Amino acid sequence: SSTHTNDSLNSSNYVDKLKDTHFVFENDKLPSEIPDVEEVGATTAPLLSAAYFIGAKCQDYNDDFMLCQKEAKGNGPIDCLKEGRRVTRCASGVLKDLNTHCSDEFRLHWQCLSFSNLEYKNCRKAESLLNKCVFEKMNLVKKIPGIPEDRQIHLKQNPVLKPVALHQDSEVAFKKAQNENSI
Amino acid sequence: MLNNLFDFIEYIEYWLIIVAFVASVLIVVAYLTVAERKTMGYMQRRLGPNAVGYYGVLMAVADALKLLSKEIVLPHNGDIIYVMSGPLISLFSVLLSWAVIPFGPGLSLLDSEYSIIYLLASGSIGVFGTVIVGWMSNSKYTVLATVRTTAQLISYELVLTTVVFIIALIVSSLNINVIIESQYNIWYIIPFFPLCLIFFISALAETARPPFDNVEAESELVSGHMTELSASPFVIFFLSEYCSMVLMSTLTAIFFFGGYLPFSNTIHHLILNLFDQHSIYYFIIEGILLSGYLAIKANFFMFSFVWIRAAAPRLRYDLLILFCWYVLLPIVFAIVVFAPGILYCFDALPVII
Amino acid sequence: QSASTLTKEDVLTRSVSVLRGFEVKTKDIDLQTTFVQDLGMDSLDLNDALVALEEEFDVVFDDKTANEIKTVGEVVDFVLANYLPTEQSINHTIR
Amino acid sequence: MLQDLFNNYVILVGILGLIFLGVNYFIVESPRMDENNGNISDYIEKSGPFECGFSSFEQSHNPIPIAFILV
Amino acid sequence: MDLILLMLVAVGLNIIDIYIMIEILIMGCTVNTIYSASLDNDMIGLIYSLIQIIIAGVESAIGLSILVNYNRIRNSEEIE
Amino acid sequence: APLQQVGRHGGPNKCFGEFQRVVECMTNAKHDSYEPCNNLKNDYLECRKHKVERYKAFLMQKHAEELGKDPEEIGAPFVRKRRFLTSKTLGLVDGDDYEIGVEKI
Amino acid sequence: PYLVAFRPAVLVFFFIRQPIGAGLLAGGFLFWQADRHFNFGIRDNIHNFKQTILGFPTQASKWETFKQVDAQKRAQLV
Amino acid sequence: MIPFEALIPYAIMFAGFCLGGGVMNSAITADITKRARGPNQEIKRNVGEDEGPRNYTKPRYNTDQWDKYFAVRDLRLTGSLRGQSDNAVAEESFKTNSIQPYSNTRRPWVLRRHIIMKNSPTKWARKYSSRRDEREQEIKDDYIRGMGE
Amino acid sequence: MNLEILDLSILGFYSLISSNSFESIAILVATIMPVITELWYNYSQLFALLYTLIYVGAVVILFVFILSVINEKEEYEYEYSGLFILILVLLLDDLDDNESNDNDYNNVYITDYADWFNNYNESDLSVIGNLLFTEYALLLLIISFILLMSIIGLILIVKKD
């Protein structure tokens, strides 16, 4: 979906010229009565790599924030500031743990995603190493709700759709774990 | 210098990419004319051009340069609008259609979820360029070609559009690059062999190529709409017609033969394993392989465009009208119902991922 | 729309003007003026006048009428009875 | 989806078409360098329509019946 | 300049020129509908816009057929 | 009840909530007249066109002109060219003023 | 996006065929671009004149309503 | 008997596709990777001694609205629309560098300047009749008059 | 520099001077092209392509009808006009281009705030098809009913027998 909107960046500068778009900045911070929070610094690739680990670790805070939105009756952005900060800190903690326990496996995964159009199906080898490392060091398991445990696509042995071009770093790391970990 | 040059190149880098892209298409189109004459020659047991450049490699250059050094015939110098409006519209229509042709994953100038619509819409504009030449013209042979040109459009346009929609319906996407990636496990030639034949027939009709060469039948309408054209207007129309031949040959490779996908997955991995992915040399080779896969499939149908010309006589345009409406349209409309019935029956309705 | 707008006086007036562009004997031309006697027209001179009169009124004398016409009044009667406006294109009428 | 690259290509395509006409207009030798038969606007024997050798009736704006009009 | 009915001069003096004028006028309404729907982020208006394009195409076909037969009647002797 | 004001992704758009509250007020039996629902109708029309808010912006701009206030001193900074959303404007620590790449994402 | 590619060709062919007719249109086009780019306000004055003569609410009419309200509200407070 | 002279033009056409594919696959990938290194030209061009092997980012295709939001968010974090960063905490500059596009909502130029398309009973009323604008100005006037109470 | 203004001015100039029917169908093409391009940017790329797909096919059928009707009428009919008066007419029409008289709506810019609640993102065409085939399926079926009437209608009007 590449529909032009007034809420984000459009397709080309000709659209900006026709719309006379002004990219407006604000130099004012949040008022002091709202406690400050540390924003998440992960880009698109690390966030997609850690999406299921944030959900597993921060499920109760994700639900509580979203339940606050529904029960606010239209006043979600203002009322649920407190619940929003809980999610931001919890999500940051997951990324901090990934940089202290599984940095090599974590970086291997989202760099594969940047190499393969950010598609999960093209980085199974790197994801499997990452999933094993996170479970053994954080007790967090990727789970896809609504389907039986053995019918998860990320655990499929012989997928119909496979990446066209292999990721060399993923291939080398996968072989280093096949022979060593599984003697 | 140095610092002011190492960022000037970055400032103009993407213009070099487009210029290289334009040259890549022009080279194929330029040597398609040479390839067609060489291919027909051996099938007709002649040789084809071999005396213009070493083994005939400069034949395309000589034909273009000689025509670019020819007088432009028009009633008045100010009448440059009349004989140039037609060819320019036809040339712009086919060149803009190449923007959505991906030589690799994401390697297309225009990426959009409506690339299929843009492809068909841009091609339909090229028909308007042909009919412009017959602008209350005093040439009787130019007029007769315009009537035939409109008749051919009514034949293939419905058939060609619906066949492309079936492939889009099977993938539930109007993005060309998504259609290419959806053929990783199966090439659509196997499930839709009748559609590939129908698509190729419509491609021949669209480009006014034999056996559907009624617009430019030398034995019927001397030269058709180009009988009054010379020098640059003839070149632009000649360039546009052959640019459509390459484009339709490339489209056939995309819709039914997986586009740029490798013939063998094992061979693709072995070749790329010889190169380091931390160096740019891997991505230079990767682009050569992926486009090489597209080139081999596209060259086969460009060969087939020449092959059918050297093996089949021309069919009358009134017979073509009955051929598409009585035969092709019922078949394609039958398939557009058959395909969803199969997919729904086995719980395999397509989604975009 | 497609109907004659001629009158006997206007047709006679224009018939006289056409015939005065030739080398006729007399410039006094009326309905009873004969081509052969009063105007002194021979075979070819008479046919030149008839074709010239055809050009003015956009009518075509038939063979029998042209080979038997004697007076100017017969020419006037033929023009009134047979003249029709030329059919226009579809755009001229309904637009 | 960014389309700035696409816009540059469309601009080049439009300019490219004018180059073919501009090159042909600036490459051909002048008429005086050729047989010097004058401008094409005066050479009526050349700018006239082609009818395989013999001139015929001029029917540029005559109606053309079409047998596939219903199709 | 619109209140003096300036558009009546921009329309040509042929029957088919009246047809072209109607297509342009209907196309203006569809463009306006797309303009409103896109701002509102309303797909209902885009459904309306698509319907207006399809319906206007049907109108052109019917009008052309009447004009085709009307031109046929005048050139209908076909004695040759 | 037919769906109106559907977003580009199949769900409600920005102004569906205003429209939904108008329908609920008009079809509620407890009301005797449509006067209580008048304020809800204005909000829905304000959601689409923002005519009152644009009018408020017109007054503030006009009021600042008579006071001599410079627009750049009380306004909001903006950039007109997307390629010039440089890292220096974004406030990055090592931010440079070189143009950003917007040709192909 | 087709007009982007077509525009150079039609403009060049316009001047080649009707140089004087194209010059007047191009000159008129550029004059009203200069008026808007240099903030000369020629088109704004015509728009203000049209709204005033046709009974429309004008920029000055809207501002006068605010002044009347501001004067009234200030008097009420004081 | 395979005629190799007939296959020479096909080999050149084969090289024609490879020229486009080789340049596009490599130059576009290199440009994205170069701009993801940092916000300044001294990092994009100069390669540090302690930096590891270069990891390339391939071009992105088949995007949606979420990817447009991500691209702007990545710009405010790295100075590139596809910048790379796995930091747990963002910089202080990320708090106040948000970009909000403000634009006009006027009708297309063809709708208000075409010699034929702009003429309709409702468009004339909008353009020449003050009945709509006079009534709507009441709502704007009611806003200021309802402040003092 | 809004170049759409210049293109429409050129198109408007030829509308007042168009004489034959071929120049009129050329006006139609010179009208759809600015519409498509202005739709391709700004508002809606989807309907810019839809306009090209449908109207270009109608143009060719329109053009082929002209070849069967032209009857020499406008090849010799004279027109008078005058260069000065034509420019004056276009200049006055150029003076007023404000289709609406809500100055606040035309001069004050607005923004929208995007949200992440729509994790399922698809093109507008899919949403149109979702509603057209489910919510407004009656409209789709009636449109097919109208298309059926046109097919029968064309045959009875045109066919001699």
Ligand SMILES: CCCCCCCCCCCCCCCCCC(=O)OC[C@H](COP(=O)(O)OCCN)OC(=O)CCCCCCCCCCCCCCCCC
């Ligand atoms: C920068 C220049 C811009 C120029 C824009 C207009 C271009 C020239 C067109 C001539 C102007 C006529 C149209 C004017 C707008 C339509 C009339 C109208 O709505 O009233 C406006 C005008 C003043 O209105 P006012 O009372 O001051 O304020 C509104 C308060 N509620 O009330 C008026 O008195 C206006 C004059 C209307 C009365 C004379 C016209 C009617 C009588 C002659 C009719 C001739 C045509 C008849 C056609 C009948 C067809 C059914």
Ligand SMILES: CCCCCCCCCCCCCCCCCC(=O)OC[C@H](COP(=O)(O)OCCN)OC(=O)CCCCCCCCCCCCCCCCC
């Ligand atoms: C696209 C690039 C290649 C085409 C470039 C040709 C440029 C010519 C002008 C293009 C149209 C611009 C808008 C004008 C509307 C059509 C008016 C017209 O009939 O064509 C203009 C042409 C000029 O010759 P002229 O003698 O001055 O006019 C006849 C005077 N009795 O008089 C003619 O009848 C000649 C017609 C030749 C065939 C033109 C067919 C229409 C071309 C439309 C394609 C471009 C789309 C419009 C782009 C500009 C939009 C304003």
